Amino acid sequence: NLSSQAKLWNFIYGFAESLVLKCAVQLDLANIIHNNGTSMTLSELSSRLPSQPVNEDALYRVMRYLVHMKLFTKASIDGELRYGLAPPAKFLVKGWDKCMVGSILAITDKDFMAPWHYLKDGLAGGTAFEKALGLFNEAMANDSRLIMSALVKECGNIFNGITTLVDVGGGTGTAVRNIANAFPHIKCTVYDLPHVIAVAGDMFKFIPKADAIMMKCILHDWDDKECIEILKRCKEAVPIEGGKVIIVDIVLNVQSEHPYTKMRLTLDLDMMLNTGGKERTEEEWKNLIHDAGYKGHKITQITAVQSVIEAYPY
Amino acid sequence: NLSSQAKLWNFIYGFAESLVLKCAVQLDLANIIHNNGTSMTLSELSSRLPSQPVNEDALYRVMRYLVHMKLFTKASIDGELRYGLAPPAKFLVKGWDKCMVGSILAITDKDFMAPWHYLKDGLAGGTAFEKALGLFNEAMANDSRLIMSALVKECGNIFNGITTLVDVGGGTGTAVRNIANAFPHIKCTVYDLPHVIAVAGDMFKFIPKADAIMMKCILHDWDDKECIEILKRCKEAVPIEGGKVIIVDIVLNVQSEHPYTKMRLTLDLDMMLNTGGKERTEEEWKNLIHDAGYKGHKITQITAVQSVIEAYPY
Structure with a gap:
């Protein structure tokens, strides 16, 4: 009909x-x-x-x-x-953590919608953003706030067994203090990477040593090779016996019936248009972690857009 | 959850x-x-x-x-x-009547999407199109092709009992020839209205006399008063005994479960943004037809976005 x-x-x-x-x-x-x-x-x-x-x-x-x-x-x-x-x-309604006003205003902004009109030119051999156009950090600062809160409440045991933790790219450290407050025995160090204001292996070669390295929404911005280099540096930074890497990032499953499947696929397309990154499937995470010379991995679902990948290097 | x-x-x-x-x-x-x-x-x-x-x-x-x-x-x-x-x-897939390529390309065009970003300024006391930006006639010529074909096939009896019919605004007459071909005993006259290339009552005061006047997607571009004047002129043009007006236009019912309810509401918003017209509910059509001094009306659903309103003036 x-x-x-x-x-x-x-x-x-x-x-x-x-x-x-x-x-x-x-x-x-x-x-x-x-x-x-x-x-x-x-x-x-x-x-x-x-x-x-x-x-x-x-x-x-x-x-x-x-x-x-x-x-x-x-x-x-x-x-x-x-x-x-x-x-x-x-x-x-404003005034609570899950308020979505900031996300709505950033995503539906006309200029940030503009790249999507250039999806086609994005299939012909430059980011669609430049072809389109030539703050909202609260949408991210808030997002990282809901992720951290989920980590502590829904799968806190991922921080078990360690006494030190380095958070790569946490900026001021707002995010990792959720860990520092829920787990006062864990010495938390934030570490921003040295970058040019105008490759990955040298940018990562002096990560502080810690029982665990956490990377929240970092690896989706790098291609497979640079991710492998990143993971190798991280492996160098953690102890042989009980050291591990904690990745927070989307795990793409188009076969899933999870309510967020659709928006996760959409965000993969958005990464294609704006940054050139991608969101990886479980199989892609598996192959990438194994290719880094790691021994194992474990995916945990949380009530957030991202999932948690524990990666064991030894 | x-x-x-x-x-x-x-x-x-x-x-x-x-x-x-x-x-x-x-x-x-x-x-x-x-x-x-x-x-x-x-x-x-x-x-x-x-x-x-x-x-x-x-x-x-x-x-x-x-x-x-x-x-x-x-x-x-x-x-x-x-x-x-x-x-x-x-x-x-191109090459058949119901092919939607033209509609997709016109509606999702960036410039024709632009007014929707100015929906808010459209609530503060000018068409959003001017605020946004300062052919596709095939999307309309085709649309009018599917409407006419539905009229003949799904509710052809609306053209019963008449020998003459005037189609207001049919341009070259492509649309009304479906009638002329299915009903060769009906003398069909197309009539474009005199308009300024830079009110309704004088623009309509010399409609050719006929058993029936058909207005396909005309009245949704006029406010209630001008529609009443239009209907009064049409009433003058048709015979007392078996004369009638045939309106083709959306009948808005937000309570409906029809698959097209959503897009019909959306097109009402689009008319607000671009033309300043509206899509009317059944009750609005009733009040408008009765206010024109008409005696009755009857709504027929067809397999199209628009419905059919037979309006009886005597």
């Missing part, structure tokens, strides 16, 4: 959901309703908008679309139509 | 599906595979691409995404991985 054609129409207009979600975030609808403490009429909503004079017909149509997306609700209460929050809209 | 958060991530990256579909169309993947007559290996596919030197890793990742979208297929045949067409991909 129409189901296959509708599948195509829904793919064609998929950008509408992204850009109506952006509008809902730019209008701060979720927080207006949340701060009000109860559902709101259209005119009540319209008065609190950071805009000035408001087209209420157009707001009504935006609200209708958002209700159909099941992000907001519409109810007849006392013969008046009132707008509320659907459960998913909780991730649009 | 993660299902609500995944709902949000899938909304955020909804534009990825649109723009990977565009890439698949720009690469002509569906027709390469179709013309080959059987599934193809990555290197076989890569050789036939209108590109020149081809990044095969990047093509592989695009193909992986397209297979996960269930538009293309991947199979191990003779220990070799071969890419084929999933059923929906039939609408990507």
Whole structure:
């Protein structure tokens, strides 16, 4: 019947959901309703908008679309139509760790969407970003905040048996202090790599010695060879008996039914367009770790986009 | 669990599906595979691409995404991985009426997507198109081709009982000749309206007399008042006893489970951004027809995005 054609129409207009979600975030609808403490009429909503004079017909149509997306609700209460929050809209309310406002605003920004229009030129023998265009660190600082919190709470035993840990690329050290606070017996050292402000083997040849090296979202930015060199340096830095490397990064499984499978594939494409990196399958991680001369590995799933790869070098 | 958060991530990256579909169309993947007559290996596919030197890793990742979208297929045949067409991909193969290549290329064009980024400024008291940017008529000529074909085949009886018909805005008359050919006893007259190349009542005051007036995708571009004036002129043009108006246009029902509900809502938003028109609910059509002094109406669903409103003026 129409189901296959509708599948195509829904793919064609998929950008509408992204850009109506952006509008809902730019209008701060979720927080207006949340701060009000109860559902709101259209005119009540319209008065609190950071805009000035408001087209209420157009707001009504935006609200209708958002209700159909099941992000907001519409109810007849006392013969008046009132707008509320659907459960998913909780991730649009500010003031808690899982708030997604920053991610939405960064990803749906027009300039950061622009490379995706150049996906084709990206298949013909330069990053799509340059062809497209010639801060949001909170979206990353927050992301690294949810990852660390998951590590401590969901699979804390990966930090068992060690007394020292080096976090490569942790910058100021915000991330690794979750470890330092949950495990005060672990001496945590942050280590940023020396890099040119204008290869991998020399950039990594003086990693501080520690029982374990942690690399959160590092290796997805490097090709297989440079990753092998990185892993070899890390192997040099850890003790023979109980030393290990902790990689945090996506494990791609297109056969998975996990709710995040789709977005993980999408982020692989985004890495292709913007950085030239990739997200690796379990098999790719296996071959890369074995090719580094490591002895074993173990993947742990956490309630995050990334997974955890424990890699044992000896 | 993660299902609500995944709902949000899938909304955020909804534009990825649109723009990977565009890439698949720009690469002509569906027709390469179709013309080959059987599934193809990555290197076989890569050789036939209108590109020149081809990044095969990047093509592989695009193909992986397209297979996960269930538009293309991947199979191990003779220990070799071969890419084929999933059923929906039939609408990507050229050479038949329901081919959607033109629609995909027009809608996902970057400049025609640009207004959607200005949805917010569109809620503050000018069409988003001007704020965004300061042929595809085949997508319309084809669309009007599928509508006419549906009219004749699915609800042909709407043209029963008449011997004359005027098609307002049919241009050259391609559309109304489906009627003229299926119903040779119906004298069909096309009538384009006089318009300024730089209101509605004078623009419509000399519609040719006929048993019936047909308006395909006209009224969604006019506000309620101008539509009422239009309908009054049309009422003047048709006979008292068996005269009628035939409107073809979306009937919006957000409560519907029809596969096209979502895209119909989206097109209402698109009309808001680009033209300032709207798509009307059944109740809005009812109130507008009754407000025009008409006596009745009847909605017929067809296998098209638009529905059919028979409006009886006497």
